JSON list of C-alpha atoms and ligand atoms in Angstrom, two decimals:
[
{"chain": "A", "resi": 1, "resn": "UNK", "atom": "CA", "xyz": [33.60, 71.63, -10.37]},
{"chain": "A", "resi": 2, "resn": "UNK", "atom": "CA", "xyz": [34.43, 74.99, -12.24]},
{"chain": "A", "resi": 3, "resn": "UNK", "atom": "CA", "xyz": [32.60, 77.44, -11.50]},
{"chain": "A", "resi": 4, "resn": "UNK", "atom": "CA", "xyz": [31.41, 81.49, -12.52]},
{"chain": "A", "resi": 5, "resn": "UNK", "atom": "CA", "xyz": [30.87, 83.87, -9.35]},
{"chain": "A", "resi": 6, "resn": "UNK", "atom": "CA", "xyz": [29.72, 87.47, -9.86]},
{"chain": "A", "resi": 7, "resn": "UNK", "atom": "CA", "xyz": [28.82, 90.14, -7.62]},
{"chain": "A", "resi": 8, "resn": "UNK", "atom": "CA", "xyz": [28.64, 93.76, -7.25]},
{"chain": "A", "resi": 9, "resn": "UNK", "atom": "CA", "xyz": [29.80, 96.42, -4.80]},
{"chain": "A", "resi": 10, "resn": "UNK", "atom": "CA", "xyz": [30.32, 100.05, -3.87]},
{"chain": "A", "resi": 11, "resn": "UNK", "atom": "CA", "xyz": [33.23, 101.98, -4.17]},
{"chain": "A", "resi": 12, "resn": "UNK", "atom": "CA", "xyz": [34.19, 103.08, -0.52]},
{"chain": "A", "resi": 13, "resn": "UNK", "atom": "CA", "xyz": [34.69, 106.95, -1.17]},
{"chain": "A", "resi": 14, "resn": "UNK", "atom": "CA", "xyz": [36.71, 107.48, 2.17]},
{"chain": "A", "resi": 15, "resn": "UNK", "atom": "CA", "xyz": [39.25, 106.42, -0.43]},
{"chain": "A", "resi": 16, "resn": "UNK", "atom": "CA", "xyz": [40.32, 109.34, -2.11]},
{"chain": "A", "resi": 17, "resn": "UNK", "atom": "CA", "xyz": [42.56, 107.89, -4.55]},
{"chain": "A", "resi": 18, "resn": "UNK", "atom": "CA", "xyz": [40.65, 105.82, -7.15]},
{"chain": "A", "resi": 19, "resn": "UNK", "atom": "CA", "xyz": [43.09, 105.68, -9.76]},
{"chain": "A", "resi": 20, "resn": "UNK", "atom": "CA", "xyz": [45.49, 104.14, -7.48]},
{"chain": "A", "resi": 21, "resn": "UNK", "atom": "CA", "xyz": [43.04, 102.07, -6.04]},
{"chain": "A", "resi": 22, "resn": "UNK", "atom": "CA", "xyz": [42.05, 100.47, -8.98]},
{"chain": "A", "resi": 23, "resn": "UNK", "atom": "CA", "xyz": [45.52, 99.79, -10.19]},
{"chain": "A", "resi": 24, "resn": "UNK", "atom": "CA", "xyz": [46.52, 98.19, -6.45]},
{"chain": "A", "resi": 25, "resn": "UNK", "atom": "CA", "xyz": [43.40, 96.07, -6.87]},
{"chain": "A", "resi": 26, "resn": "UNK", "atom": "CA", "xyz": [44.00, 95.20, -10.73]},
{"chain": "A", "resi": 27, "resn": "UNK", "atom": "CA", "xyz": [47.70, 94.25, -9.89]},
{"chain": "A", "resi": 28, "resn": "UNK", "atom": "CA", "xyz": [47.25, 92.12, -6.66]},
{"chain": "A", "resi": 29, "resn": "UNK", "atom": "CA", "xyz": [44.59, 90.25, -8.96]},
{"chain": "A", "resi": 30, "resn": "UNK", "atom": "CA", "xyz": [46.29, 89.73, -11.47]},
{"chain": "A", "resi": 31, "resn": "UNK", "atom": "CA", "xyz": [49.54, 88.20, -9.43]},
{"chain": "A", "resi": 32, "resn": "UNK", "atom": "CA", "xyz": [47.42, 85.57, -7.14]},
{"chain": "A", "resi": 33, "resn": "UNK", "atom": "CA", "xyz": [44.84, 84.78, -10.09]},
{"chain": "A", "resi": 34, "resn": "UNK", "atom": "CA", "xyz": [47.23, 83.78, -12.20]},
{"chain": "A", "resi": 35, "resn": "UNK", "atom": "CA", "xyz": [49.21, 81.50, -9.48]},
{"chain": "A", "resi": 36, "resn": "UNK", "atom": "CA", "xyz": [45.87, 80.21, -8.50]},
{"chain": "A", "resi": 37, "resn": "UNK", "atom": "CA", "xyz": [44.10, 79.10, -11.92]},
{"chain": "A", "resi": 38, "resn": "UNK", "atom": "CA", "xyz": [41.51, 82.25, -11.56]},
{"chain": "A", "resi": 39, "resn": "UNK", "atom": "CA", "xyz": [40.65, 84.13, -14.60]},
{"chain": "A", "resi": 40, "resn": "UNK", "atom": "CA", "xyz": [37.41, 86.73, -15.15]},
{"chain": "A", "resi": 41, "resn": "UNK", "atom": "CA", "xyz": [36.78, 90.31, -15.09]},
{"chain": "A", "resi": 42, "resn": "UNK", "atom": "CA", "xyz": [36.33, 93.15, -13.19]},
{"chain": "A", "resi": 43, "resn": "UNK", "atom": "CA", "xyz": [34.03, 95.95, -14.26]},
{"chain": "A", "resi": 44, "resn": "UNK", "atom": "CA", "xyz": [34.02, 99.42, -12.34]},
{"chain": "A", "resi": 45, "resn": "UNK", "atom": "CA", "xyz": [31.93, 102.45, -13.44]},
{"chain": "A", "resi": 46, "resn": "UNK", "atom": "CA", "xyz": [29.69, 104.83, -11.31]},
{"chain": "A", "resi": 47, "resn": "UNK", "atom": "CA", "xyz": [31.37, 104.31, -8.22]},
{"chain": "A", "resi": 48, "resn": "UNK", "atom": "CA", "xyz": [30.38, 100.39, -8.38]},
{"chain": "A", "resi": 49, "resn": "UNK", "atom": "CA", "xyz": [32.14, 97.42, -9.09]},
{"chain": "A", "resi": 50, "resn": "UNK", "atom": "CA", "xyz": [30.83, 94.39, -10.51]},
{"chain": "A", "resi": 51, "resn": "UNK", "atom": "CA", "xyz": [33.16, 90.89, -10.93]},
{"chain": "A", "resi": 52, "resn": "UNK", "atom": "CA", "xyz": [33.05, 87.88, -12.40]},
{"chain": "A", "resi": 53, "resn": "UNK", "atom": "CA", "xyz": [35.62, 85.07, -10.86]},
{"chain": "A", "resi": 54, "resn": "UNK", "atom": "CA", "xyz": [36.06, 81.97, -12.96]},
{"chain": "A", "resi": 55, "resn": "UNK", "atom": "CA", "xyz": [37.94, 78.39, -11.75]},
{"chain": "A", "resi": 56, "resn": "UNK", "atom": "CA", "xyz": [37.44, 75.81, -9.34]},
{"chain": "A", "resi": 57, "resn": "UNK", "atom": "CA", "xyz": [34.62, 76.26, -7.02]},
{"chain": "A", "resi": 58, "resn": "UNK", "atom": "CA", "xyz": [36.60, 76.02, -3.84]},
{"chain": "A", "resi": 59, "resn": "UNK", "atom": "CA", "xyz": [39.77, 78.37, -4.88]},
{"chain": "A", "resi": 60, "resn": "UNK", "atom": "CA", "xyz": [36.61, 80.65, -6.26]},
{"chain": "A", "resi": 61, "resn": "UNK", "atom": "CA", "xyz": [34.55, 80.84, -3.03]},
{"chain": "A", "resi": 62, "resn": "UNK", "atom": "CA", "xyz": [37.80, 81.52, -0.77]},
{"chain": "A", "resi": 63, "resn": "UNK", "atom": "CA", "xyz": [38.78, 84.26, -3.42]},
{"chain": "A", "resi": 64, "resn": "UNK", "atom": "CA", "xyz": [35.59, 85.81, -2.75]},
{"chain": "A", "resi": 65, "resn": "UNK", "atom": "CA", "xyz": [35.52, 85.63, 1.45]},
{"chain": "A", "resi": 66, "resn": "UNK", "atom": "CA", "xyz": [39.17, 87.54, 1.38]},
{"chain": "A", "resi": 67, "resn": "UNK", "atom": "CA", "xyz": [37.49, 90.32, -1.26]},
{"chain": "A", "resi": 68, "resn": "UNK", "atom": "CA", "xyz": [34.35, 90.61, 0.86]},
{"chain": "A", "resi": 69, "resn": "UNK", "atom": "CA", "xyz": [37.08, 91.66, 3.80]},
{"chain": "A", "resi": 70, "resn": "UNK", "atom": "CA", "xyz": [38.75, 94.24, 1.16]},
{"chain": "A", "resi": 71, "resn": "UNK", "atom": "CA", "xyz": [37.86, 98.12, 2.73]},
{"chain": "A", "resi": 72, "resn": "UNK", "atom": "CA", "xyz": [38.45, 99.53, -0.95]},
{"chain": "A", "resi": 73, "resn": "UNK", "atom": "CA", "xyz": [34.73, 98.40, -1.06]},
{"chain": "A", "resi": 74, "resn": "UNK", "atom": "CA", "xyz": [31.34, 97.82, 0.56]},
{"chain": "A", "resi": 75, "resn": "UNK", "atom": "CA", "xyz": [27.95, 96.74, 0.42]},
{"chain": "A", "resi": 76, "resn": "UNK", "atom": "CA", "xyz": [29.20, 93.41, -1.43]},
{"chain": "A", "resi": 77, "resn": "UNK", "atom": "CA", "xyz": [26.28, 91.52, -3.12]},
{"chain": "A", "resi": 78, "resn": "UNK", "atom": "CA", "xyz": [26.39, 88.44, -4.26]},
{"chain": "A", "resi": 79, "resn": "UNK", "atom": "CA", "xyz": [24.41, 87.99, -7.60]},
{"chain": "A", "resi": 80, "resn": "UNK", "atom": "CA", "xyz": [25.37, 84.07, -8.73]},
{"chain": "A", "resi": 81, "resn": "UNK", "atom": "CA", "xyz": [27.75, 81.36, -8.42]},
{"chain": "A", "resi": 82, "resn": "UNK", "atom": "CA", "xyz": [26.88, 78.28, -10.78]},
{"chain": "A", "resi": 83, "resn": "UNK", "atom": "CA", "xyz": [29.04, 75.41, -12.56]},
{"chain": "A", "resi": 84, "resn": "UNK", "atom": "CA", "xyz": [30.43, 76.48, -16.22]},
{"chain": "A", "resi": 85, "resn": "UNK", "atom": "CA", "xyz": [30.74, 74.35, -19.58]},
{"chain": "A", "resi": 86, "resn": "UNK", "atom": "CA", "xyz": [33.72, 76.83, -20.71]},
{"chain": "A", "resi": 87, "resn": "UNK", "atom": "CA", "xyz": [36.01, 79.54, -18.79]},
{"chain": "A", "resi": 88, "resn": "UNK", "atom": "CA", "xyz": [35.25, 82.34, -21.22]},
{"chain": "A", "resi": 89, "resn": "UNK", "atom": "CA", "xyz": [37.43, 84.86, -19.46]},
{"chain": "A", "resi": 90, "resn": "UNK", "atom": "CA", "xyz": [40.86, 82.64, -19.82]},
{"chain": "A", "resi": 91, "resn": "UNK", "atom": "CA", "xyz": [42.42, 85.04, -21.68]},
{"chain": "A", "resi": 92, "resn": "UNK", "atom": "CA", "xyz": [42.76, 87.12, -18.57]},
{"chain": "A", "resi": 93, "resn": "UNK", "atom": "CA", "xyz": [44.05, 86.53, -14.94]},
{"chain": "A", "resi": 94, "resn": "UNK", "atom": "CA", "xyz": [41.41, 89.20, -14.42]},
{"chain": "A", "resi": 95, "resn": "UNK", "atom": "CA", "xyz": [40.65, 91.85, -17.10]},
{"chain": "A", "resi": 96, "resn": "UNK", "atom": "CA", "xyz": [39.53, 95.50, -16.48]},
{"chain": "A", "resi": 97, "resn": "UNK", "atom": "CA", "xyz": [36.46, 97.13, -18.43]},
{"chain": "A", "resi": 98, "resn": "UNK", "atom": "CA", "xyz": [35.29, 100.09, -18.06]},
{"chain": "A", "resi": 99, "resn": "UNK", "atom": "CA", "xyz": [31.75, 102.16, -19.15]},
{"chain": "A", "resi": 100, "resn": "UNK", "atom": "CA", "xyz": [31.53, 102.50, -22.50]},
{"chain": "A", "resi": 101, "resn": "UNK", "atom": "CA", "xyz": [28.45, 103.28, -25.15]},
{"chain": "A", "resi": 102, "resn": "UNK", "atom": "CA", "xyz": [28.41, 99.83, -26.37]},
{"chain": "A", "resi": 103, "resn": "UNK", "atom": "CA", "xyz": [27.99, 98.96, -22.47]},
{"chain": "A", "resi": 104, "resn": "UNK", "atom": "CA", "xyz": [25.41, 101.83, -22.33]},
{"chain": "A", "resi": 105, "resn": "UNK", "atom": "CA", "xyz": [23.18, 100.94, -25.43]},
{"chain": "A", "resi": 106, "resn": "UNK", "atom": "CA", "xyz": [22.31, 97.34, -23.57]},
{"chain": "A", "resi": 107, "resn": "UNK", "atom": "CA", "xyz": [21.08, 98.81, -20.45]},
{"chain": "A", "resi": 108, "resn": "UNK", "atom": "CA", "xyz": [19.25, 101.28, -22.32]},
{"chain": "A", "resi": 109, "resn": "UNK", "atom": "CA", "xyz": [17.70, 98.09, -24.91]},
{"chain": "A", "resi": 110, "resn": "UNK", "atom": "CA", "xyz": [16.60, 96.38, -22.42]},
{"chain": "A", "resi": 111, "resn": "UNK", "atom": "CA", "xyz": [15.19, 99.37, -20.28]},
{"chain": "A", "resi": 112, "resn": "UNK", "atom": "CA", "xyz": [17.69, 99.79, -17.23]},
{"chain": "A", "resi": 113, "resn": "UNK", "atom": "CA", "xyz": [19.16, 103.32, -17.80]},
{"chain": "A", "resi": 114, "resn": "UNK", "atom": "CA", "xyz": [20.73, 103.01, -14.20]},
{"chain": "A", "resi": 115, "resn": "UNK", "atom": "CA", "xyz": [23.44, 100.63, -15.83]},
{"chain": "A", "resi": 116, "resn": "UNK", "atom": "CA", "xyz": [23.45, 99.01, -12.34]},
{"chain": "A", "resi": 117, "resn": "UNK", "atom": "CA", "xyz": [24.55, 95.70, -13.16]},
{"chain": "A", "resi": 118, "resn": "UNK", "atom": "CA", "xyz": [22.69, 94.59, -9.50]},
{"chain": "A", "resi": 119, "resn": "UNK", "atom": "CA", "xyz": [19.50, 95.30, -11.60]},
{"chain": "A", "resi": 120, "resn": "UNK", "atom": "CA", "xyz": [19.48, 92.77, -13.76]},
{"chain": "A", "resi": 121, "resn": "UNK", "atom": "CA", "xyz": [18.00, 89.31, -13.99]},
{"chain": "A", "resi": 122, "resn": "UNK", "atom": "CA", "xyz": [19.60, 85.97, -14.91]},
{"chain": "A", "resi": 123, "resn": "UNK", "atom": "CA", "xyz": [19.16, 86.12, -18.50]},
{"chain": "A", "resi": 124, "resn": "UNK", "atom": "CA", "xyz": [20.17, 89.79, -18.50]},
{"chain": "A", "resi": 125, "resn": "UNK", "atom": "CA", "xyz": [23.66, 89.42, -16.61]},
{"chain": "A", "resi": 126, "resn": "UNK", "atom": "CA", "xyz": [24.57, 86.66, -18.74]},
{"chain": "A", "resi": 127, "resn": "UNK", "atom": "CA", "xyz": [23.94, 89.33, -21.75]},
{"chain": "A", "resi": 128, "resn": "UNK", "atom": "CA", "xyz": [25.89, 91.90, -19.35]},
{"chain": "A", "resi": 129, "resn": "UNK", "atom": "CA", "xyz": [28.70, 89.33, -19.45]},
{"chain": "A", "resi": 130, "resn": "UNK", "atom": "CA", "xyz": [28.93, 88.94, -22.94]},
{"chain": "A", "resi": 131, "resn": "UNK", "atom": "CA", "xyz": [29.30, 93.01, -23.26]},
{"chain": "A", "resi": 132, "resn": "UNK", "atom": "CA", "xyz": [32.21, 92.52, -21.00]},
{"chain": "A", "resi": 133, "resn": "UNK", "atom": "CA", "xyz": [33.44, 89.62, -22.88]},
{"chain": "A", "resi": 134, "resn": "UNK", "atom": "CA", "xyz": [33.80, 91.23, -26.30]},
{"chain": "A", "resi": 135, "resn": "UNK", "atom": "CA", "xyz": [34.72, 94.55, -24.84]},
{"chain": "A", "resi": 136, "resn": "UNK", "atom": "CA", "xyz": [38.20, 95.60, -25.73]},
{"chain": "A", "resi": 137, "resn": "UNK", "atom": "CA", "xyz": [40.38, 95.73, -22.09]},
{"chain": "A", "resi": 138, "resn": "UNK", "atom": "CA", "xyz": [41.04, 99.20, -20.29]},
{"chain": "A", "resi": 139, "resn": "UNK", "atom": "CA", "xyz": [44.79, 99.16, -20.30]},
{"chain": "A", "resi": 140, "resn": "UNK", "atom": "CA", "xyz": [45.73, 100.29, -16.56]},
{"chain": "B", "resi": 1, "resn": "FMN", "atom": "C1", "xyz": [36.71, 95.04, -6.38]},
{"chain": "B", "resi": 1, "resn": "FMN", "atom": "C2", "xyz": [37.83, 94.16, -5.96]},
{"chain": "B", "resi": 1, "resn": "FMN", "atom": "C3", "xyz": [38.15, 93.03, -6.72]},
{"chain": "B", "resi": 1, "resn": "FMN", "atom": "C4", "xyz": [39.19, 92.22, -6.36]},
{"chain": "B", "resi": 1, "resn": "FMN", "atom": "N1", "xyz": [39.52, 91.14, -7.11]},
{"chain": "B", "resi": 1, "resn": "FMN", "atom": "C5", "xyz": [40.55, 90.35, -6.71]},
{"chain": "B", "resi": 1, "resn": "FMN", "atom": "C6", "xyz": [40.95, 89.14, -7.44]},
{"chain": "B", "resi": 1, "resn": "FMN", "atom": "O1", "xyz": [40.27, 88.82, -8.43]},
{"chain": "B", "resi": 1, "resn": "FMN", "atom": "N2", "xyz": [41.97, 88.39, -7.03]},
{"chain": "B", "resi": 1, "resn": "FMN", "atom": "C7", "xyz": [42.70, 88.76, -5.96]},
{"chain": "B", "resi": 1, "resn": "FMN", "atom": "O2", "xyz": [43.65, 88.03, -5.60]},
{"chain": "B", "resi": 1, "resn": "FMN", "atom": "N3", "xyz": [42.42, 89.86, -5.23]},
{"chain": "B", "resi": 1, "resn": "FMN", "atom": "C8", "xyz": [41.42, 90.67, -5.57]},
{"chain": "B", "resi": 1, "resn": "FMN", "atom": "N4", "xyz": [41.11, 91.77, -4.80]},
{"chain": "B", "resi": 1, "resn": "FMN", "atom": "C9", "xyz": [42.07, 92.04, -3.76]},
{"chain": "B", "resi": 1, "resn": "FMN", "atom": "C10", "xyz": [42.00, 91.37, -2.44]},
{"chain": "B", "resi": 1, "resn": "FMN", "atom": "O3", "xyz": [40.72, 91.68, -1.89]},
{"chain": "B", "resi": 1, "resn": "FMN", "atom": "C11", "xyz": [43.22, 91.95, -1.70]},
{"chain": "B", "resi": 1, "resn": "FMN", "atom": "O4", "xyz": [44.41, 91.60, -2.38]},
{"chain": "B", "resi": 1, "resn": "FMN", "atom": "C12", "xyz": [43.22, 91.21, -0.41]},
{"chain": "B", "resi": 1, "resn": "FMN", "atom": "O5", "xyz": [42.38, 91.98, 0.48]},
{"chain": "B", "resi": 1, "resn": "FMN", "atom": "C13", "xyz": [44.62, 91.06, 0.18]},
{"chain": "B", "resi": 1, "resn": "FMN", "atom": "O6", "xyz": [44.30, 90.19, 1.24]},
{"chain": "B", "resi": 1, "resn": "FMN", "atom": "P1", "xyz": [45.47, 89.69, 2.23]},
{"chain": "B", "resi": 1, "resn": "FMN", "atom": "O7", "xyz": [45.85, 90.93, 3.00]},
{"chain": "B", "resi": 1, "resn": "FMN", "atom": "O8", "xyz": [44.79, 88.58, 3.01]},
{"chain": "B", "resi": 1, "resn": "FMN", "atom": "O9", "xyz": [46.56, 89.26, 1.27]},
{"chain": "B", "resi": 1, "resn": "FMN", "atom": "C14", "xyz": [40.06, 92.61, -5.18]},
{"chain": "B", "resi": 1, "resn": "FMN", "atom": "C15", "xyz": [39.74, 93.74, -4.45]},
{"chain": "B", "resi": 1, "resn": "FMN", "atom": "C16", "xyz": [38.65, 94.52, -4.78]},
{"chain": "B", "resi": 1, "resn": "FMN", "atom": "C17", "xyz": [38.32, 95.75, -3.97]}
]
């Protein structure tokens, strides 16, 4: 079975180095998801991160137990894990997106001006998913 997981999580501010953070995270990704048949995306804004992990369920679900251990965040939540027709983040071993006001006009159209991606309902992250989709990639 293939297989989307998403969840969200907080940015551990004992970290004081973001920037570097976020490139150590986008770079280990990107090596192991690639040997590993992952693809997906990672979204960070307002100290929060929220992922999508695409490929077989098993390789998936492990992928996500090693993250959960990861002290660059906290308060992991899982939102949904459920069997796909089409990988529609192959393009990318995992790409990075970032707030933008495309982003920001479909929380505020559908009345979530928190853009807390933990908010949202089934029908609404799949929506959320398609921002990220069609969003152009944050080069790191
Ligand atoms: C928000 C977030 C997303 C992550 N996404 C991935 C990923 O998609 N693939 C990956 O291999 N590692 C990812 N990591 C990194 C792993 O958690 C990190 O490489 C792992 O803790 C190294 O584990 P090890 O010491 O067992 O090798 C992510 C880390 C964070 C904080």
């Amino acid at each position: 079975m293939n297989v989307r997981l998403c969840y969200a999580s907080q940015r551990n501010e004992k970290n004081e180095d973001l920037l570097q953070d976020l490139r150590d995270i986008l770079t280990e990704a990107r090596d192991f998801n690639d040997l590993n048949g992952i693809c997906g995306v990672l979204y960070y804004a307002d100290n929060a991160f929220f992922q999508c992990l695409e490929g077989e369920q098993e390789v998936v679900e492990r992928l996500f137990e090693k993250i959960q251990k990861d002290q660059r965040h906290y308060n992991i939540k899982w939102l949904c894990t459920y069997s796909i027709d089409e990988h529609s983040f192959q393009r990318w071993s995992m790409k990075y997106v970032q707030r933008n006001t495309n982003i920001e006009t479909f929380f505020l159209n559908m009345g979530e001006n928190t853009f807390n991606p933990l908010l949202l309902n089934q029908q609404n992250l799949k929506f959320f998913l398609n921002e990220l989709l069609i969003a152009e990639q944050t080069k790191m």
